[PDB]
């Protein structure tokens with residue numbers, strides 16, 4: 294398991310937590326020195342538990358699929374909550390079975406459906422460590438509309454930060470003040486599968502992408518990523534989604 298406490302949290306401890314989260318995910322190989330997530334994992338070992346504590350020391354446990362860093366569901370006190378999707382239904386066969394009741398959230402876990410439920414796109418939702426504190430507190434007591442926004446915060450401050458050093462840094466810059474995500478953050482989130490695929494395809498193609506990926510950079514400009522010497526590949530991305538799952 295991994296754990297993170299918001300009480301006393303600072304950019305350093307958050308950075309350490311994200312390092313630990315990345316290193317909790319299994320891999321058999323690296324591609325251009327980036328861990329390649331496994332094609333599949335059978336049984337309970339498929340799920341990483343993240344224990345998150347809000348500033349007051351109240352806690353939720355979050356179940357993460359280690360093949361794709363997708364949040365499946367979470368436990369708050371004696372109630373489990375799972376996304377309305379087959380992968381999360383499966384997860385519920387393995388994690389939080391001791392919960393006195395299971396609520397299936399009235400949406401799947403993807404950004405499109407979460408944004409509709411929250412009534413707001415990601416672009417307009419501030420993120421940061423204070424927002425994560427808020428998100429944990431919200432998830433403690435069921436409210437599906439509120440939970441959609443909280444989960445958008447949770448996903449980006451944990452899974453997306455694990456996937457991209459740039460996003461980790463953006464959250465560190467928001468340790469004591471929330472701010473909506475940069476355009477670059479959104480672009481990276483939207484491109485994780487595509488980047489992952491092209492980096493794997495580049496192996497056998499001399500580091501050259503079969504299909505370029507268009508991102509927005511930290512200055513707000515369009516950039517085209519065509520090969521593995523790009524900073525997005527050498528410094529930024531930290532985990533690759535296996536092409537078997539794309």
Ligand SMILES: NC(=O)c1cccnc1
Pocket residue numbers: 362363364365402403404448452
């Ligand atoms: N459900 C998730 O954890 C999730 C959603 C969208 C993108 N990445 C992860």
